């Protein structure tokens, strides 16, 4: 068919108010708002480093059953650092 | 199911048919030049009969063309990431605020933008002005008891805007 | 160590500061962005250093304090470990997150809510640290359901678009199935063991084993997109690009096999149970290989390939290796990471359009994303010998040696060539053909942000899997004797899968339209399990809710049975009682029928 | 405000005098206006519609609630709130509905079958036993310190 | 993400994809020129040409427009509607 | 406790003896004040109840729900303006002294050592309630909601008078203590089966139960703001603490006769939540939210471990703050549009920016967000009745699922996609909403914090 | 070709083969043409009732309200009470409560007989 007239004229009545409200919302006072007036690692490495090994001393030295734990594992050719002697070394090989 | 008219025509439904017949054969076929191949042989095939003077047999045939198109669809046809039940949905409605907001504003953010509130106040006025007697004689005016229809004849008549113009005017910008 | 213990609870407690900080803040710091990833940045380099001191030694620690509801014979308090897995799986999470955080900084610019982003982001981020580190079974329940709102709230971060809400809301029913399944077999721990905790339960194995291997199948399915469980997959692609990067490439996606790599004493035994961990991921596996062929958004083909790698983990825990799947998560993690983040470059470069049809051809569109996008689809089935090379090679060698239930090994085959073949076919279309895109090209990465990230999740994509699979100790016996044509079929199906989609590809250069023979709409319709279920549950449920449960039974039978027969017999015997003509004879009848029935009819003065 | 005869008490009869208050008061064709009937459900006399109405109504009309479907006139079926999207696809199926259900039920016993098949019929490569030298590894399973010695040995083969 | 699209510049590119297309002429061809009128083409390569428009600019246009183009200078109208062509 | 009664009565007069734009003020802040003395009650140890002299003492059971009630009480006395802000002096004077005259007996019934005692202030507690959403209850059949409400309760609670009477004069007099170091095991014959119907079934009626759960719906809907949550929160969870105190008699009995009320709980409890999943009428899905959580409680006191016990009231507690926060968000939705509906006033995610937080919290909270004290009270309940029987665990994850459905469907659906473009009334969020929010939700994230105070007497 | 496309509750019958709109009557005609001025007619009642600038507050849609009202409290008048409503109640009523009280009775007499023999595995067994 085709555009009537009637949709034609209606049409282009609404295209000039719908231009002209878009080339009104561009805002430009040619300023947009108006007021009305390390460090950051030094303390992420410093400051909660501080307070938690503070928190890991003293408060688990209250309480008792507390952070453990799993035990450092020795061999025969070692020894123990502590007291000061030798587990005796592992044996034979043989049949390589 | 048409705001002008009560049904479309044949000619509507042929045309389509002719139209999702190409969009599903793009989501069909890729490389786009054996595509333009089969589109050219779709086009063929409906200047197979377009010199019917029947019209049962023309609508007999358009229903065996549904029949054929329905056999030979695609299950994701490629709807464009614009349109509703593709990838945007009105994907940016976040930031759709209507414009009968904005003024519900403390009088210091209004004072932060003096222009634009000024230029709001002139359109308001705009509305205001011309709203009652104009609108409500053309639209009391032009039908008859009947309505029958759903457009609105535009304000042809002296003076201001056609009527029933505000949030359509009124809108977002589709990419806010 | 005091160093240990204190690095690890700062590299939790530098995940804190932000969150507060702009619930403090009043003042709207533009740099926020900026401090969220260098404060993420820190929190991974101090947490590499922990780790390093685990490898040195060892020395496993747990830690444990600030006691609450201490009630019966249990007790509770806020309680994590740093075992193995605890420990490695953090930083290979904090360093693909930070990349995320570079991919979300560029892609997610020019959105004015990117602070709601961010804490958003940081949260889950923290929730899924919760989950990975505890021991007490409470706080894995407090990270489970965490990632899932988190997850929710990410999903749905676009109010608006009903496929984003409706999506989310899949997402959050399934996780209440997860839900379910976990609290089963929270029930059973407590109530026959005493506790809820890794290490009480592990020091006593327990006889009676189906309950709560059955409660951990159905968390495991509720959580790691299994089949019968999957389809909110492509729901949760139908997010933003960052959000579905991090919800599928590390966190939220792998808590439900880490649970059964946590519970590893206890699913050493009960062969039954691991017959039902291969089973059902081989399940997994082959529906997924199926279902990814024929399908158009590059996130949801994505989406389908790590389903499919987490059903090969399930296979890797149905055999006896833990270790192996928890250094495929972490390789797995790295890998669709980095190709999540170029392939979401992708679609911002081409106008958010996403599909693959209408994006045929943009190599020597600038190399350097269709580089990493060839350097992710082909270390996907293992560039002999790269990072994707050792996991999924000693997975399904370990498989091969071992007691397989006679078909899953087939399963991981027939899998393993199509995701060769998608992965090529994936390249071809995407990158490779005649180029179809719209005209007026906006293709830009002039980006210090995009190749920084890019970048460097190539060069952990290419160092990365060698570096965790040195120095590991070895928790299992490697098997390291295999037949001729046993390790060789795992690259010889892969190059013939290539070869396979190599003449697919050739004849899609031909021009014959074929007619679809429905193992295509098989492929192509998502095997018809989310049409099916999601047209046929949402039914029986509201059908029987509003005639049976709303309208029927509660509302007009409960009230025909309590109000309305005392009212009807009340209003009844009101009209037939007060009712009466006012005469005065049958008043005085009324009396002398009183008193013979007194008198002579039910006595009185006898 | 809300007129009293705005309410719907009482069903269908008689065919001329509720038939035609009903289409004053839906705002409906005469013929269009189907009560279900009332077959003792309650119901009022709320109208029949052609019940999926949610994946139909395609978008490009532009009526007033695009994801509510209304055009604030609408007699809005009895069964609205399981039809909105989020809720139920009523869409048409591209392919059928019981031959889809029969692919995948036939599909999930193929693959269960093949899966107990392969659960009475296990594969091993030829390998024998793991020789666990102490005992089996006696003294640090779940107790016998001293309770029990069971002497078995392996043999050099 | 979004070029500075202004409107003389789009009709010169509508108009260039209407030259760019075969059997019709860029000698008698302007803004205001026919699709069903002037140039005599029919309704099927009318919606061939709409076609064109839909996949070089990547949105469709509805059916209750798809009959009632007919002119270069309309068809600018509507996508200035789509895309809303200003500053 | 009489020191925590007498300024209570003083208050009164405070109301009536402050002038016009002046008792507003007053009340808010003198309840206040009463909220402190009543947070300094918390002295509770060991081995014995607390008595406040003869004719007091508290458990460690009514102390949380006794703090709980006069922090909840100034919350609804600023929660009930701006629908009777602009009615008479002299009337809303009335009102706001009926509202404390109904806390005065709220706290009647909570401490209470006799059961004649209890049951005095449990119909007194009943009256003034009847009188608000009568008089206030703004919709068409508030008359009938009052109505079903004062009947269902009275035809209920009424034989409970007489079994009370009855162990009054066969066993001594009504002390706990002494209702407790005395009880011998009644046996099983029939009439100790209808007198544990009879006390059973008033708290059941009071809960409600779900045969009886339709006297409620009608009493919140057509019920104002101040009445609901009095109603939900301090009511429902006054009936699970009278059922608390009186189910220590009669033991060997509910073993073999407590099976099922049991069943019409939990089958009530899958269909309730089935049935909230649906409706319009936005306020009535946190009715039936309520009746879900009630049925799950019933669930709890009917089988008798103290792991449920504590689950019992942990559950109690925060659902009480949950559906009072969630009934002040629907009052605060039909303060901006007057259409009490569900699918008409959808969008508010770009209006009202941070109203959406705290619906999110709130229906994160009813979510039973982990942490919460909601999931402690649902878990711990969730142990106890798998320890009771072990099959009931997929009754109890499937109203979960549920649960979470229609939570978070209310959440997507109201507040969640698009403003239909016609509402163009609503004004954005005052400072009063938002205190009252916080005045929600800083007292459960402090309890999720430090739960230990709100675990019952077996702790 | 196709099996001609069977439709069910589930699967929407699409706008191509109705095939009903390929009869086309003046009285079908009548009434796709009055099925339109009636939405004419309510299109036009709302745009003027929803442009007005001085009109405050919500549409007040008399449909919406028509619709509560019938959902809500227009359930139990009208009603009358038949063999199929009684049956349908007592099936789904007190059906499935007997069912579940009957396995809990089932499971309750197992666990019962069993800890009355004693063969539990309680050898720690405390949160009960
Ligand atoms: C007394 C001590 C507390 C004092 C708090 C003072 C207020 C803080 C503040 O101003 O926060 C800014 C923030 C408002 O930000 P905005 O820039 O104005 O607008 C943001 C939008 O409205 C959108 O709102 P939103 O995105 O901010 O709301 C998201 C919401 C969602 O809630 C969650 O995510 C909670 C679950 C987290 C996982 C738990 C494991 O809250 C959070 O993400 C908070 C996470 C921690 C809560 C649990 C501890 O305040 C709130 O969101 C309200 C308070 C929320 C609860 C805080 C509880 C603290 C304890
Ligand atoms: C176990 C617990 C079971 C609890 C059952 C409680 C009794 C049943 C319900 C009582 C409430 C009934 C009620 O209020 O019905 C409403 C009806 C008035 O309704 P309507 O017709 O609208 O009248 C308005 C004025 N014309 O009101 C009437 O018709 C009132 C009729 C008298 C009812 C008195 C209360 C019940 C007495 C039972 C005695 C045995
Ligand atoms: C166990 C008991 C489970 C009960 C589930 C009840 C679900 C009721 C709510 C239904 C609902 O909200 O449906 C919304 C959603 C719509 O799905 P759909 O529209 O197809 O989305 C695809 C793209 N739009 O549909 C859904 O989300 C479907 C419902 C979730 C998946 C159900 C099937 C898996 C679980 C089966 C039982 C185990």
Known sequence: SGYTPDEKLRLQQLRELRRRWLKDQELSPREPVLPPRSIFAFTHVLIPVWIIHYYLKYHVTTKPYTIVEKKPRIFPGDTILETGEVIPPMKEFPDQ | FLPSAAYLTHQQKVLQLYKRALRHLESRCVHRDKYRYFACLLRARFDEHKNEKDMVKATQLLREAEKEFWHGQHPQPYIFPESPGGTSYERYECYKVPEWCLDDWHPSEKAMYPDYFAKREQWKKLRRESWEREVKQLQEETPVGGPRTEALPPARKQGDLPPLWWHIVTRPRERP | ?606 | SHITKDMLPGPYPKTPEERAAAAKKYNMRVEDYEPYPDDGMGYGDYPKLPDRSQQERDPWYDWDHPDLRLNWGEPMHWDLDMYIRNRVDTSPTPVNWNLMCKHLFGFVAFMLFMFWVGETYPTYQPVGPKQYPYNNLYLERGGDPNKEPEPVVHYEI | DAPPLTLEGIKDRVLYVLKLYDKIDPEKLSVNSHFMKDLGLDSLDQVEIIMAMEDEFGFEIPDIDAEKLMCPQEIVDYIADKKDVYE | ?459 | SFPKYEPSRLASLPTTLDPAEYDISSETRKAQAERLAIRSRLKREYQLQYNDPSRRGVVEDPALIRWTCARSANVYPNFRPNTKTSLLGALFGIGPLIFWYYVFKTDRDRKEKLIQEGKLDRTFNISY
């Open chain 6, 1 to 459: 406790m009489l020191k925590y009664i007498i300024p209570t009565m003083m208050l009164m007069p405070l109301t009536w003896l402050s002038k016009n734009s002046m008792i507003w003020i007053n009340t808010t802040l003198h309840s206040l004040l009463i909220s402190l003395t009543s947070l300094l009650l918390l002295n509770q140890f060991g081995d014995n109840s607390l008595n406040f002299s003869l004719t007091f003492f508290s458990d460690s059971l009514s102390t949380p729900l006794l703090i709980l009630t006069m922090w909840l009480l100034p919350l609804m006395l600023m929660a009930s303006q701006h629908h009777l802000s602009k009615e008479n002096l002299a009337r809303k004077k009335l009102f706001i002294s009926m509202l404390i005259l109904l806390q005065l007996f709220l706290i009647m019934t909570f401490t209470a050592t006799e059961l004649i005692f209890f049951y005095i202030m449990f119909e007194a507690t009943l009256v003034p309630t009847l009188i608000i959403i009568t008089r206030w209850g703004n919709q068409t059949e508030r008359l009938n909601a009052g109505l079903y409400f004062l009947f269902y309760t009275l035809a209920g609670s009424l034989p409970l008078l007489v079994a009370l009477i009855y162990i009054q004069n066969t066993m001594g007099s009504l002390n706990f203590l002494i209702l407790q170091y005395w009880v011998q095991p009644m046996p099983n014959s029939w009439s100790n089966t209808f007198m544990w119907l009879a006390c059973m079934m008033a708290f059941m009626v009071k809960m409600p139960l779900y045969g009886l759960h339709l006297w409620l719906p009608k009493a919140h809907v057509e019920a104002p703001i101040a009445g609901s949550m009095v109603l939900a929160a301090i009511l429902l969870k006054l009936g699970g603490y009278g059922m608390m105190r009186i189910t220590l008699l009669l033991n060997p009995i509910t073993d073999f006769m407590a099976y099922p009320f049991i069943m019409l709980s939990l089958w009530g409890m899958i269909m309730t939540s089935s049935i909230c999943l649906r409706q319009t009428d936005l306020k009535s899905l946190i009715a039936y939210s309520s009746v879900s959580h009630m049925a799950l409680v019933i669930v709890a006191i009917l089988i008798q471990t103290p792991w449920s016990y504590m689950g019992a009231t942990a559950l109690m507690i925060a659902h009480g703050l949950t559906s009072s926060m969630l009934f002040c968000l629907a009052n605060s939705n039909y303060e901006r549009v007057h259409s009490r509906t569900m699918i008409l006033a959808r969008g508010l995610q770009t209006l009202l920016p941070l109203m959406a937080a705290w619906w999110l919290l709130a229906s994160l909270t009813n979510l039973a967000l982990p942490p919460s004290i909601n999931l402690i009270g649902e878990l711990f309940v969730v142990m106890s009745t798998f320890s009771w029987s072990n099959i009931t665990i997929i009754l109890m994850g499937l109203n979960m699922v549920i649960t979470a459905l229609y939570s978070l469907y209310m959440l997507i659906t109201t507040q969640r996609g698009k403003h239909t473009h016609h509402i163009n009334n609503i004004l954005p969020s005052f400072t009063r909403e938002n205190a009252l929010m916080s005045l929600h939700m800083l007292p459960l994230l402090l309890l999720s914090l430090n739960p230990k105070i709100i675990l019952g007497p077996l702790y």
């Open chain 3, 1 to 606: 160590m005091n160093l240990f213990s204190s690095l690890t609870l700062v590299t939790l407690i530098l995940l804190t500061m932000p969150i507060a900080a702009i619930n403090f803040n009043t003042h709207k710091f533009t740099n926020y962005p900026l401090y969220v990833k260098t404060t993420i940045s820190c929190a991974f380099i101090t947490s590499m250093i922990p780790t390093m001191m685990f490898i040195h030694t060892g020395q496993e620690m747990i830690i444990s304090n600030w006691h609450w509801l201490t009630i019966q014979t249990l007790k509770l308090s806020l309680s994590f470990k740093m075992d193995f897995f605890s420990m490695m799986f953090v930083p290979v999470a904090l360093f693909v997150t930070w990349s995320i955080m570079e991919f979300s900084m560029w892609y997610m610019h020019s959105d004015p809510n990117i602070n709601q982003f961010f804490k958003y982001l940081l949260l889950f981020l923290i929730t899924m640290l919760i989950l990975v580190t505890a021991n007490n079974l409470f706080q894995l329940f407090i990270g489970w359901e965490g990632v899932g709102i988190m997850s929710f709230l990410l999903i749905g971060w676009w109010y608006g678009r009903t496929d984003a809400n409706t999506a989310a809301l899949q997402a959050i029913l399934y996780n209440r199935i997860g839900d379910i399944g976990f609290i089963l077999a929270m029930a059973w721990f407590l109530i026959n063991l005493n506790t809820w905790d890794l290490q009480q339960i592990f020091m006593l194995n327990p006889n009676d084993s189906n309950l709560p291997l059955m409660g951990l199948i159905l968390a495991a399915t509720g959580k790691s997109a299994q089949f019968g469980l999957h389809p909110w997959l492509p729901s949760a692609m139908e997010g933003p690009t960052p959000v579905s990067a991090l919800l599928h490439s590390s966190t939220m996606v792998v808590a439900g096999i880490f649970l059964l790599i946590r519970f590893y004493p206890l699913t050493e035994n009960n062969k039954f149970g691991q017959s039902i961990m291969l089973c059902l991921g081989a399940m997994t596996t082959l529906f997924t290989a199926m279902c990814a062929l024929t399908q158009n958004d590059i996130k949801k083909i994505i989406a389908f390939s790590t389903s499919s790698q987490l059903g090969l983990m399930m296979v890797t825990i149905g055999i006896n290796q833990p270790h192996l799947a928890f250094l495929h998560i972490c390789t797995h993690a790295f890998f669709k990471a980095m190709l999540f983040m170029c392939s979401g470059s992708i679609i911002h470069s081409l106008n958010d359009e996403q599909d693959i049809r209408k994006m045929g051809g943009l190599f020597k569109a600038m190399p350097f994303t269709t580089t990493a996008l060839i350097i992710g689809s082909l270390a996907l089935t293992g560039m002999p010998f790269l990072t994707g090379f050792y996991s999924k090679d000693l997975i399904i060698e370990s498989a091969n040696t071992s007691y397989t239930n006679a078909w899953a090994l087939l399963m991981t085959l027939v899998a393993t060539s199509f995701t060769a073949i998608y992965s090529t076919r994936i390249i071809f279309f995407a990158l490779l053909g005649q180029p179809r895109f719209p005209t007026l090209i906006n293709i830009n990465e002039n980006n210090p942000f995009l190749i920084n990230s890019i970048k460097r999740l190539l060069i952990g994509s290419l160092f990365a899997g060698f570096i965790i699979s040195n120095n590991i100790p070895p928790m299992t016996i490697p098997q390291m004797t295999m037949p001729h044509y046993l390790k060789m079929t795992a690259l010889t199906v892969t190059i013939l899968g290539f070869i396979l989609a190599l003449e697919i590809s050739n004849t899609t250069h031909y021009l014959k339209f074929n007619y679809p023979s429905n193992t295509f709409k098989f492929s192509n319709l998502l095997g018809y399990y989310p049409t099916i279920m999601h047209r046929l549950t949402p039914y029986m449920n509201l059908t029987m809710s509003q005639k049976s449960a709303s309208s029927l039974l509660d509302l007009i039978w409960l009230e025909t049975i309590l109000p309305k027969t005392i009212s009807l017999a009340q209003m009844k015997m009101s009209t037939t009682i007060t009712s009466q003509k006012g005469l005065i004879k049958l008043y005085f009848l009324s009396f002398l029928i009183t008193i013979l029935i007194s008198t002579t009819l039910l006595n009185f003065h006898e």
